[PDB]
Design a protein around this nucleic acid. Structure first.
Ligand code: MG
Ligand code: MG
Ligand code: MG
Ligand code: MG
Ligand code: MG
Ligand code: MG
Ligand code: MG
Ligand code: MG
Ligand code: MG
Ligand code: MG
Ligand code: MG
Ligand code: MG
Ligand code: MG
Lengths: 141, 55, 125, 179
RNA sequence: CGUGCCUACCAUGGUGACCACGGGUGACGGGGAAUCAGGGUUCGAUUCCGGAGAGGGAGCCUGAGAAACGGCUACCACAUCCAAGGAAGGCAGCAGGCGCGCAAAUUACCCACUCCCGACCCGGGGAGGUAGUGACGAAAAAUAACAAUACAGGACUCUUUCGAGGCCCUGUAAUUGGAAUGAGUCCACUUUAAAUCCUUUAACGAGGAUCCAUUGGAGGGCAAGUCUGGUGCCAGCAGCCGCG
């Protein structure tokens, strides 16, 4: 099975260094395609510009029309369909707004209800969606 | 084709309810004292099968 | 009323000075000021009061003791010699009259740009 | 550049499971029994006991005639006796692991007030040791998390204060109302 | 100065499957940091040490020490004045401004402490220290607390008690004081180069209009409601299972 001699440690580290790439997490952490292929340029948050508002559908067991925003980024310049979280907020996210986006619970997968949305809206013109939903005074219109 | 007009439908159609004037709560250690006086060896009349912290 | 006791006591005969650590007792009112502790130490040393210095006062969180550093000197000329101007400023011996930022540096710049008679006219006037 | 101080210590036990029913019941009956505020000052005592247990297991790992073990074990026994958790009896390292959680809460400031009087409802004794009314010695004690050492253990007096010292803190309001 | 460091001649060598050579590093190297069996895994630009550079990159005077840039010379990219023949520049120093980005502080004061420089006790230092923003983060820690008075929910020592409550907690928008004490308001202290903050202390300073504690949740994981009213696979909730 293994190799258990006193001078076999080079063969051991060669075998482990070869077989360590087959894990998904190691290769997505130490392969450059998860920097040159993902959005954000490897960031956590990113500002963007509202391009359009898209009503997408839910999955097959669910039945809902989810409301999302196609976001033109500032750092990279790519297009991200980002999700409108709360009950309202479609009337609070307008065209050409400074929109901060983050993940849902995982960068790789998405939410099991929405097909192709990986990211979530937090801010609208330096005013958060929690502030626009409850508590604070008025929109920056 | 999915229309975007139904935004905040339940948030609009929800009847508003005025929050009634609830008295002030207790502090940190006072709230822990209330928890120890309420939900522990202070008052336990019944049998140890069912629990009643809210009903 | 108050009680002043010196714990640590050293004598520098080179500079004709005596260093001490002063604990002032407080079972009563507030922290006794700069003048009165100095006068009581002058009464306990039985000389003229215009020569003994003291600096620093803590407070041990309600009455208790206040700890400072006292300096008994035997010559007013030695007191004027061996002491810095900021501790002469408690009695007002040294006066600088220009405690201002950028004044000396702009004088340095006016003495760095021009040279000679124009420098003595501008940077010194 | 700057050189003042850079250090960080977290006297804070963080539990692995967040919501254990028996553990929450045990920690809240501990708080309600020994008069505490929140669970981070339970985790203070738990972290100190855990660090003492780590040092005790590190000492019990070594050989018995080891001089480092003798020195550090005698120092740990001396510090625990001067705290007052141990007795003058069992000076073994296994009894240190045999210690429990509630002994440090017993040796804190409020429980010594409970055992030696002027307690009057531990929740009020918290106020009596917070406000300047219970004073271990001439250096005034203010903070309730005060490990009462065994070397003095009895000096509970107060001077220039409200109930026995003197002064009119707010009774002058009632006197001016009656006058 | 010892050297293929360089030159003339001579020999054909030297390294590599024990990974050299060739690429990338979102690579300055360490002492270290996070992570709780042991073993390990991932960062270390960052206050200490050593290296490298002062927009890119080449050359050099002086000087013991530089290929120095708060030195110079010429090129490229920038870039200020111009009265159009010419002058003048290098904040990856301290403050600050533009752009950039999810993202990071005031054109403050002082050489008072520690050191350093110079002819020298005496001058200087955005080296540093102090002050302002600051919920990166670490420690201690009020937010209404407390003892009593009275109704009862009474678990309970005890006698057919429908109580003796010298054990008791709780709903009391109920009284009562210690009128506790703190935060703030300010005199005099003190710290301090001058001050502020810490502490001492004189006087105001709580009764639900108080001096108001929020952040998430209540099907399982995962502590906690088969409560009420609307919405009726719509809105939406839910990091997965799922609900509508
Ligand atoms: Mg997922
Ligand atoms: Mg690099
Ligand atoms: Mg670890
Ligand atoms: Mg390890
Ligand atoms: Mg070297
Ligand atoms: Mg250099
Ligand atoms: Mg630059
Ligand atoms: Mg330089
Ligand atoms: Mg510069
Ligand atoms: Mg609900
Ligand atoms: Mg549960
Ligand atoms: Mg919810
Ligand atoms: Mg959640």
């Amino acid at each position: 099975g293994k190799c258990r001699g006193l001078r076999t440690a080079r063969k051991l580290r060669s075998h482990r260094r070869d077989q360590k790439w087959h894990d998904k997490q190691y290769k997505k952490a130490h392969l450059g395609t998860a920097l040159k292929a993902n959005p954000f340029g490897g960031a956590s948050h990113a500002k963007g510009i509202v391009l359009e508002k898209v009503g997408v559908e839910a999955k097959q067991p669910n039945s809902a029309i989810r409301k999302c925003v196609r976001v033109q980024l500032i750092k990279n310049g790519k297009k991200i369909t980002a999700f409108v979280p709360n009950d309202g907020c479609l009337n609070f996210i307008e065209e050409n707004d400074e929109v901060l986006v983050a993940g849902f619970g995982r960068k790789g997968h998405a939410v099991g209800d929405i097909p192709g949305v990986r990211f979530k809206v937090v801010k609208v013109a330096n005013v958060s969606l929690l502030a626009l939903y409850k508590g604070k005074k008025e929109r920056p219109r | 084709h999915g229309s975007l007009a139904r935004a905040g439908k339940v948030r609009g159609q929800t009847p508003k309810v005025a929050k009634q004037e609830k008295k002030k709560k207790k502090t940190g250690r006072a709230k822990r004292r209330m928890q120890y006086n309420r939900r522990f060896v202070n008052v336990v009349p019944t049998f140890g099968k069912k629990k009643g912290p809210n009903a | 009323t108050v009680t002043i006791r010196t714990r640590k006591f050293m004598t520098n005969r080179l500079l004709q000075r005596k260093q001490m650590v002063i604990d002032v007792l407080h079972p009563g009112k507030a922290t006794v000021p700069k003048t009165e502790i100095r006068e009581k130490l002058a009464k306990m040393y039985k000389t003229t009061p215009d020569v003994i210095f003291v600096f620093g006062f803590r407070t041990h969180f309600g009455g208790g003791k206040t700890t400072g550093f006292g300096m008994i000197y035997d010559s007013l000329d030695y007191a004027k010699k061996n002491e810095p101007k900021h501790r002469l400023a408690r009695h007002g011996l040294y006066e600088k009259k220009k405690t201002s930022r950028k004044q000396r540096k702009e004088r340095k710049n006016r003495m760095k740009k021009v040279r000679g008679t124009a420098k003595a006219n501008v940077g010194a006037g | 550049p700057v050189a003042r101080s850079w250090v960080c210590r977290k006297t804070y036990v963080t539990p692995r499971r967040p919501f254990e029913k028996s553990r929450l019941d045990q920690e809240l009956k501990l708080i309600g029994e020994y008069g505490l505020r929140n669970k981070r000052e339970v985790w203070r005592v738990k972290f100190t006991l855990a660090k003492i247990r780590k040092a005790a297991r590190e000492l019990l790992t070594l050989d018995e005639k080891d001089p480092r073990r003798l020195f550090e074990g005698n120092a740990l026994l001396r510090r625990l006796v001067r705290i007052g958790v141990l007795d003058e009896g069992k000076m073994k390292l296994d009894y240190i692991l045999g210690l429990k959680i509630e002994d440090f809460l017993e040796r804190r400031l409020q429980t010594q007030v409970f055992k030696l009087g002027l307690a009057k409802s531990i929740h009020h004794a918290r106020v009596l040791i917070r406000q300047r009314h219970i004073r271990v010695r001439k250096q005034v004690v203010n903070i309730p998390s005060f490990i009462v050492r065994l070397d003095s253990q009895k000096h509970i007096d107060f001077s220039l204060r409200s109930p026995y010292g003197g002064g009119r803190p707010g009774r002058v309001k009632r006197k001016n109302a009656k006058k």
